[PDB]
């Protein structure tokens with residue numbers, strides 16, 4: 001047990017209503033988030049490869065194992081994993097994020113934001129309950145504070 | 152140095168003409184290979200997650216580092232990496248493949264083949280020189296024989 005684990009459980013309370021509302025079987029997630037810009041997208045992938053090469057190998061392994069288990073408990077019409085496995089996933093990703101320097105995480109965020117059309121967040125939000133999306137994001141802000149303290 | 156490394160250099164001789172011919176900046180690679188079938192595709196991704204969780208963490212790390220270096224040497228109008236970095240990539244992936252049981256690798260191959268439309272290989276081949284694609288594949292057959300012997 002650790003503090004990211006505890007923080008993940010508060011994140012779930014804040015965000016699992018939102019996770020149940022997203023239709024995870026929508027084909028839209030395979031689409032570029034706006035115009036496909038292969039050269040800019042390669043830049044964003046390079047930043048993620050750098051981050052992955054720097055991330056703790058055991059925490060990467062655990063994150064994969066948590067997603068395999070989360071695939072096993074998908075149910076309902078939107079393909080949502082169980083609440084326990086949602087929390088498991090979020091804690092294991094928080095530990096990966098904490099295992100690399102802050103600059104590597106911001107470089108993925110900035111490099112992806114460059115290729116994301118400004119309409120994409122509001123479009124996604126419009127498909128779920130907006131209050132539950134707000135509550136999920138406020139959850140995320142509290143969670144990343146604990147992550148940063150282990151980082 | 153190892154035998155997969157040596158085998159990668161013979162693979163490059165056989166396959167780098169083909170790699171120069173693929174237009175790696177084509178947007179088509181983001182598309183599903185045929186009809187998007189989210190539930191079947193999740194099955195194929197689950198098999199890759201299982202394989203990744205079982206793969207040697209150091210060899211996964213080295214494979215990411217080799218792709219970061221290969222992104223650095225992209226040139227020309229098709230986005231092809233250098234010949235040296237092509238070989239580097241192929242040897243590092245061969246080592247990952249050798250670090251897990253044969254069944255995990257076949258389960259990814261079978262689970263992806265299930266979602267790949269039968270026209271997709273011939274369509275891809277039609278965009279390059281067909282003899283060089285054949286030579287690249289015969290390379291791959293010789294390479295996977297060395298991989299299997301380290302596996």
Ligand SMILES: CCCCCCCCCCCCCCCCCC(=O)OC[C@H](CO[C@@H]1O[C@H](CO[C@H]2O[C@H](CO)[C@H](O)[C@H](O)[C@H]2O)[C@H](O)[C@H](O)[C@H]1O)OC(=O)CCCCCCCCCCCCCCCCC
Pocket residue numbers: 032033108109112113116120121124134137138141181
């Ligand atoms: C096949 C090859 C591989 C293909 C895939 C690889 C590439 C993947 C690219 C596609 C994924 C991108 C689309 C994701 C959209 C979700 C992000 C979002 O909705 O974000 C919404 C926000 C909204 O903006 C925020 O809005 C906030 C509003 O808060 C206010 O209001 C709030 C509640 O409303 C709270 O009350 C809060 O306290 C109050 O401050 C603040 O103003 C913030 O400053 C502002 O940042 O937009 C932002 O962050 C701006 C940037 C948006 C995009 C940034 C990306 C975010 C995630 C990047 C990391 C990885 C993603 C890919 C990796 C794949 C995984 C392995």
Ligand SMILES: CCCCCCCCCCCCCCCCCC(=O)OC[C@H](CO[C@@H]1O[C@H](CO[C@H]2O[C@H](CO)[C@H](O)[C@H](O)[C@H]2O)[C@H](O)[C@H](O)[C@H]1O)OC(=O)CCCCCCCCCCCCCCCCC
Pocket residue numbers: 030183184259260263264267271272275285288289292
């Ligand atoms: C954003 C979320 C993430 C998105 C992406 C995740 C999912 C990705 C799915 C999209 C990628 C799939 C499309 C790839 C097509 C390339 C495969 C191919 O052209 O293959 C062509 C072959 C042609 O068939 C072969 O044809 C051969 C012909 O050989 C003959 O002829 C030859 C030369 O012509 C030689 O002479 C030889 O000696 C002689 O035997 C033999 O008959 C073989 O038995 C037969 O298998 O089709 C086959 O294998 C049949 C199966 C074809 C598809 C199988 C997949 C292959 C690769 C799977 C592994 C990973 C891919 C995804 C992972 C992502 C990476 C991290």
Ligand code: BCL
Pocket residue numbers: 015018060063064067090093096133134136137140193196200
């Ligand atoms: C071995 C490594 C792991 C893995 C490592 C990572 C890492 C590392 C990250 C992702 C993130 C994401 N992964 Mg993952 N991921 C894996 C397996 C999967 C599988 C699968 C089939 O198993 C799927 C479908 C996905 C899907 C996703 C997306 C939901 C998301 C990227 C788009 C995004 O930002 O949407 C928006 C994201 C969500 C809807 C997820 C929940 C986010 C928070 C907790 C709550 C909602 C807040 C707010 C409303 C919306 C997001 C705004 C912010 C700017 C964060 N991953 C593998 C097994 N994944 C990224 C992410 O979520 O970025 C924010 C991320 O940082």
Ligand code: BCL
Pocket residue numbers: 042045049166169211214215218241244247284285287288291
């Ligand atoms: C950390 C892990 C690694 C990684 C791990 C893997 C693993 C593991 C595999 C892939 C494979 C692939 N990866 Mg990779 N990959 C990474 C980074 C990338 C990046 C990036 C921007 O850095 C890109 C663009 C890609 C692109 C690709 C595709 C070319 C390919 C999956 C589709 C396919 O089978 O096409 C067909 C493939 C090619 C055109 C590549 C060369 C194949 C051989 C050597 C020569 C051509 C033979 C023949 C003509 C065509 C293929 C037929 C066969 C059935 C093999 N990877 C990261 C950093 N990648 C898979 C693959 O190639 O399956 C065959 C695979 O097994």
Ligand SMILES: CC(=O)O[C@H]1CC(C)(C)C(=C=C/C(C)=C/C=C/C=C/C=C(C)/C=C2C=C(/C=C/[C@@]34O[C@]3(C)C[C@@H](O)CC4(C)C)C(=O)O/2)[C@](C)(O)C1
Pocket residue numbers: 028029030031032033034117119120121123124196199
């Ligand atoms: C081989 C292998 O290992 O694969 C694994 C590798 C990983 C990395 C581990 C992995 C993973 C995680 C991944 C890739 C997550 C990807 C997330 C992508 C989210 C995409 C989104 C949000 C896309 C869009 C596109 C939109 C377009 C919207 C618009 O066009 C619309 C409609 C109408 C227009 O008029 C206006 C518009 C509004 C502009 C939108 O609104 O959103 C996974 C899945 O495990 C597979």
Ligand SMILES: CC(=O)O[C@H]1CC(C)(C)C(=C=C/C(C)=C/C=C/C=C/C=C(C)/C=C2C=C(/C=C/[C@@]34O[C@]3(C)C[C@@H](O)CC4(C)C)C(=O)O/2)[C@](C)(O)C1
Pocket residue numbers: 047048049051052053060105106108109141211212215
């Ligand atoms: C060895 C091996 O296998 O490697 C493989 C390993 C993987 C894992 C499979 C792999 C991969 C994927 C990777 C690394 C994905 C990385 C994802 C990073 C996500 C980062 C996020 C969300 C960052 C942020 C930053 C934010 C900042 C928000 C704020 O600052 C803002 C705007 C304004 C402020 O006022 C307040 C604020 C709120 C502070 C935010 O909101 O979000 C890869 C590439 O395949 C390699």
Ligand SMILES: CC(=O)O[C@H]1CC(C)(C)C(=C=C/C(C)=C/C=C/C=C/C=C(C)/C=C2C=C(/C=C/[C@@]34O[C@]3(C)C[C@@H](O)CC4(C)C)C(=O)O/2)[C@](C)(O)C1
Pocket residue numbers: 019024025067070071072074078079080081086089090093094097102105106143144145147148151189193
């Ligand atoms: C088709 C289908 O059915 O797919 C099914 C597939 C599954 C797997 C079963 C499934 C599922 C679950 C999924 C996808 C869950 C996704 C979770 C994503 C979690 C992402 C996390 C936590 C990311 C971050 C990024 C962080 C960044 C933090 C910082 O940068 C920030 C901000 C500010 C800096 O100053 C300091 C900092 C600390 C650096 C962080 O702290 O955290 C589902 C729903 O069932 C769908």
Ligand SMILES: CC(=O)O[C@H]1CC(C)(C)C(=C=C/C(C)=C/C=C/C=C/C=C(C)/C=C2C=C(/C=C/[C@@]34O[C@]3(C)C[C@@H](O)CC4(C)C)C(=O)O/2)[C@](C)(O)C1
Pocket residue numbers: 022024025026027028029030120121122123124125126128133134137182183184187188189190192193196
């Ligand atoms: C070859 C093949 O087929 O592979 C298949 C493999 C799979 C794995 C089966 C597959 C898949 C599934 C995938 C990747 C799923 C990824 C899902 C990502 C979902 C992202 C969502 C919901 C994003 C948002 C963003 C939002 C933003 C809301 C806000 O910012 C807004 C507006 C303003 C403020 O209020 C703050 C805010 C509240 C922050 C929101 O509210 O939500 C797929 C696609 O089938 C392809």
Ligand SMILES: CC(=O)O[C@H]1CC(C)(C)C(=C=C/C(C)=C/C=C/C=C/C=C(C)/C=C2C=C(/C=C/[C@@]34O[C@]3(C)C[C@@H](O)CC4(C)C)C(=O)O/2)[C@](C)(O)C1
Pocket residue numbers: 045048179180181182183184185268270271272274275
């Ligand atoms: C977040 C993160 O970590 O992301 C990283 C995660 C990874 C896993 C490390 C990673 C990687 C590797 C990946 C995903 C490789 C994906 C390869 C996909 C190849 C896709 C192909 C071939 C798609 C198609 C679609 C076709 C459609 C063809 C047709 O429709 C056409 C035209 C005409 C129709 O009439 C008939 C038809 C012929 C049927 C086709 O012929 O081919 C990467 C890139 O590093 C990003």
Ligand SMILES: CC(=O)O[C@H]1CC(C)(C)C(=C=C/C(C)=C/C=C/C=C/C=C(C)/C=C2C=C(/C=C/[C@@]34O[C@]3(C)C[C@@H](O)CC4(C)C)C(=O)O/2)[C@](C)(O)C1
Pocket residue numbers: 060061064198199200202203204211256257259260292
């Ligand atoms: C901890 C962590 O970060 O995990 C992350 C790590 C990654 C790496 C980023 C990640 C990932 C991606 C993974 C595992 C991708 C796996 C790719 C596997 C590819 C397999 C291939 C090509 C297999 C084959 C089998 C073949 C068989 C061909 C033949 O039998 C046939 C037909 C007929 C015979 O007569 C002759 C024959 C020729 C013998 C072939 O031709 O090809 C993931 C999921 O994101 C998790």
Ligand SMILES: CC(=O)O[C@H]1CC(C)(C)C(=C=C/C(C)=C/C=C/C=C/C=C(C)/C=C2C=C(/C=C/[C@@]34O[C@]3(C)C[C@@H](O)CC4(C)C)C(=O)O/2)[C@](C)(O)C1
Pocket residue numbers: 038042170175176218221222223225229230231232237240241244245248253256257294295296298299302
């Ligand atoms: C947008 C853009 O510019 O992107 C740029 C991005 C880059 C990275 C810079 C770039 C590049 C390089 C790239 C993608 C290279 C891809 C290489 C893929 C290599 C895949 C390999 C070796 C896969 C396998 C699978 C194997 C399976 C073997 C077996 O199953 C088989 C068969 C039979 C079983 O009985 C025994 C077995 C042993 C289990 C194996 O042996 O090997 C490029 C070209 O510049 C494009």
Ligand SMILES: CC(=O)O[C@H]1CC(C)(C)C(=C=C/C(C)=C/C=C/C=C/C=C(C)/C=C2C=C(/C=C/[C@@]34O[C@]3(C)C[C@@H](O)CC4(C)C)C(=O)O/2)[C@](C)(O)C1
Pocket residue numbers: 031032033036037038039041042045173175176177178179180181271272273274275276277279284285288
């Ligand atoms: C959000 C966003 O934008 O992300 C972006 C991120 C990136 C990384 C920038 C990006 C990218 C690039 C990607 C994934 C590239 C993947 C390339 C895969 C290429 C696959 C090819 C060539 C496959 C084939 C298969 C062939 C088969 C030939 C044969 O079987 C045939 C017929 C018959 C026999 O003769 C045997 C044979 C000879 C075996 C062939 O000949 O070739 C993209 C797409 O821009 C999206």
Ligand SMILES: [Cl-]
Pocket residue numbers: 001002
């Ligand atoms: Cl506890």
Ligand SMILES: [Cl-]
Pocket residue numbers: 036037038039040
């Ligand atoms: Cl571009």
Ligand SMILES: [Cl-]
Pocket residue numbers: 152153
């Ligand atoms: Cl040598």
Ligand SMILES: [Cl-]
Pocket residue numbers: 187188189190191
């Ligand atoms: Cl389906």
